């Protein structure tokens, strides 16, 4: 009635006030500042290694901490741990649910995490005494499909699901110590800060939210994309992040002045982005489109500097090492490739 | 070979054994049939599932062939984000119970359950990831349909229909209005079947349809196509 109308109205002018406040803090654009610096040249990168052995579509890969090992996930029902130098196969792990969407590698190197389309997140122990890799934990409690997972340390993990929720979990405890709610559409991705204090998540309602691990609260909400958000990640400096979407566009968002930084889009591209990642200095941004090939843009000038065209199907996952030594791309043709 | 230490050769050996186990594992996965199950709710989906025997799974064997059914009823998520995971399945099985036109779903007294089932079949049949995928349409709970139809002609849900209100003409009309929804007609085939809750054939029907799909796939592999 009158109370409902007045409270909905009040919500409306508060949304208007927040919009006016982020408009009122802008006085310049990134491109105007950055157009002067000399552009990097053509980034000619060749396939120095080709990892083969998956028999189906690949959705997830994650680099190791030393910048020599990595892990990958496919619909075959297998997780695989690789040796990037000698192209050896270090580990091969089965799964109980073939329908996986994400995997992650512990920052120490003792555990890995896998999950998707089952409402679970499983934790496996690599460096065991017994010689094998075995399941340590079955985190349960979401009501949608699990879209992403990241290790905070050896005991804390943060998950985002399709039922519009994010959560923080304590692997030893086996239960959620914080739930982050407020997305209307399905949440598709999340990325952790360099120092593990804040994390961003992006969802199907064309928006992203910044969260406080300790406070379990939505500090900022970011909008501007016309469609879904497929992938997200921080800048290495920890004060910006990059969003990949389903309307053939990539975007950069700041945290301190929560605005739009830059947009990366070309008219010849009309397909969807599946992954983004950053460089060691944050000078190059890698985007994996599903026009079968990857693009390497200037993360500072919104130009195009190179292409990684060696795949014969949809490019799903993508990653960069901790030192900058290589990049790795996976795809729906079941082949992983290392570029230098 | 000549540059590798005594410890590197053992690592190469381990990687090779992992390779052979991956290859052996991925071949047994290609001797099984993938069927994706859809329906409008209590459309007899559960009853066909109990007839043949998170995301739910079912496994069965019949005359030396292994079938897998992937039931996605309870996902309740945005379907466009998880549907392409089934892009390469063998068949779709779509269940609708044909005595469910007078009784309307709790959502609406006016928009009937048949209109919702029509929306579902239309949306699935023209999906971009299923342009070469065959569909098996089960029409369930037939015996009750005569009791429900003799009290009121199909005009409630089929006002533009004219018939003496016997089971044969009514059910046949319903089937027509179902298979006319296809928009491929050249790279897709639809197999329709009328059955009650209990049966002694719903299993042979799927065997036949999948045998047909397999033989066509083989002939396409030849190039004799």
């Amino acid at each position, epitope marked *: 009635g009158s109370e409902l109308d007045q409270l909905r109205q009040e919500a409306e002018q508060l949304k208007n006030q927040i919009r006016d406040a982020r408009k009122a803090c802008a006085d310049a654009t990134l491109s105007q500042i950055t157009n002067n610096i000399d552009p990097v040249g053509r980034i000619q990168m060749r396939t120095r290694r080709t990892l083969r052995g998956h028999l189906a579509k690949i959705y997830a890969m994650h680099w190791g901490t030393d910048s*020599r*090992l990595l892990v990958s996930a496919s619909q075959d029902g297998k997780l695989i741990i690789w*040796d990037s130098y*000698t192209t*050896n196969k*270090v580990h091969a792990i089965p799964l109980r649910s073939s329908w996986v969407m994400t995997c992650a590698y512990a920052p120490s190197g003792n555990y890995v995490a896998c999950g998707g389309l089952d409402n679970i997140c499983s934790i496996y122990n690599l460096k065991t*005494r*017994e*010689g*094998n890799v075995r399941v340590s934990r079955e985190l349960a409690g979401h009501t949608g499909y699990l879209s992403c997972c990241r290790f905070l340390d050896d005991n804390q993990i943060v998950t985002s699901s399709g039922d519009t929720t994010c959560a923080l979990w304590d692997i030893e405890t086996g239960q959620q110590t914080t739930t982050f709610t407020g997305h209307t559409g399905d949440v598709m991705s999340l990325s952790l800060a360099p120092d593990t204090r804040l994390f961003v998540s992006g969802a199907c309602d064309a928006s992203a939210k910044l969260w406080d691990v300790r406070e379990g609260m939505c500090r900022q909400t970011f909008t501007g994309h016309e469609s879904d958000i497929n992938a997200i990640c921080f800048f290495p400096n920890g004060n910006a992040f990059a969003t990949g979407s389903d309307d053939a566009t990539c975007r950069l968002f700041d945290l301190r002045a929560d605005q739009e930084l830059m947009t990366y889009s070309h008219d010849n591209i009309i397909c969807g982005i599946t992954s983004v990642s950053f460089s060691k200095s944050g000078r190059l941004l890698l985007a994996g489109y599903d026009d079968f090939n990857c693009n390497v843009w200037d993360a500072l000038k919104a130009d195009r500097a190179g292409v990684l065209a060696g795949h014969d199907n949809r490019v799903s996952c993508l990653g960069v090492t901790d030192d900058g030594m290589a990049v790795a791309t996976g795809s729906w043709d079941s082949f992983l490739k290392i570029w230098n | 070979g000549c*540059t590798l*230490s*005594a*410890e*590197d*050769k*053992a*690592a190469v*050996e*381990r990687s090779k*054994m992992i390779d052979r186990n991956l290859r052996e594992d991925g071949e047994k996965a290609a001797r099984e049939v993938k069927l994706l199950l859809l329906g409008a709710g209590e459309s007899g989906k559960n009853t066909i599932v109990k007839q043949m025997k998170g995301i739910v799974e079912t496994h069965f064997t019949f005359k030396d062939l292994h079938f897998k059914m992937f039931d996605v009823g309870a996902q309740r998520s945005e379907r466009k984000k998880w549907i392409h995971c089934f892009e390469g399945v063998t068949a779709i099985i779509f269940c609708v119970a044909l005595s469910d036109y007078d009784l309307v779903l709790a959502e609406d007294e006016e928009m009937n359950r048949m209109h919702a089932s029509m929306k579902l079949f239309d949306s699935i049949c023209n999906n971009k990831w299923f342009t070469d995928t065959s569909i098996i349409l089960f029409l369930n709970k037939k015996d009750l349909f005569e009791e429900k139809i003799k009290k009121s002609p199909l005009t409630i849900c089929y006002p533009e229909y004219a018939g003496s209100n016997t089971y044969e003409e009514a059910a046949a009309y319903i089937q027509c209005q179902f298979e006319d929804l296809n928009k491929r007609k050249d790279t897709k085939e639809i197999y329709t079947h009328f059955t009650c809750s209990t049966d002694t054939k719903n299993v042979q029907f799927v065997f036949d349809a999948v045998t047909d799909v397999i033989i066509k796939n083989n002939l396409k592999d030849c190039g004799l196509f």
Partner: single-chain antibody
Amino acid sequence: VQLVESGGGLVQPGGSRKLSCSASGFAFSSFGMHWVRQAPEKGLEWVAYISSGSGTIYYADTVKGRFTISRDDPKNTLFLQMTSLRSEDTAMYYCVRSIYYYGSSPFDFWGQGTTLTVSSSDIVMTQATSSVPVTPGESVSISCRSSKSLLHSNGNTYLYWFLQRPGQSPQLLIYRMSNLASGVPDRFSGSGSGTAFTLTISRLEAEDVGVYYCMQHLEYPLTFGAGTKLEL
């Protein structure tokens, strides 16, 4: 985890004998197996190697064609078979497990071995010192040398340090001449360069006394040094 080994005894010089270890508590079918021999009041010597999948087999140059190793993964049991036993085959035998992949720690668990008595080029590693007296509470150092450079081109340095406390079996202390095995205190360390290396201990403890050994693993055969005893 454990590798209970059996098969020893006294043997006439002309005769056959088998030595079988049973592995319980781990994935035995993913572990290269070795036999390493030690002589009474002497050092120890490598014997033989069989890898994961029965692909590569290696024998010591002094045992060729007269020893035979064998594996059984369905029941996790490994054998060695002997037919010609000269008087210098009286020793004890320790069966060691190891696994090879990037970051692995070979020669990790050791077992207990069995004692067999008999009726009466290669890199060289030598431990010049035979006994360093010391009282608890200060630094101790032991030095080992090789006939050439053990730093392989790939970057590794296949030198191992390991200990035998008086009255029991050995256990790994340092693998690849710098890295510390799991389950031992940080009292121990190992440094070196080229062909000269030193094991070192900072704080001595009543459990730290033992006989210390160095090994290289660059190529075959695997060659030890002498046994450097410590006394209180």
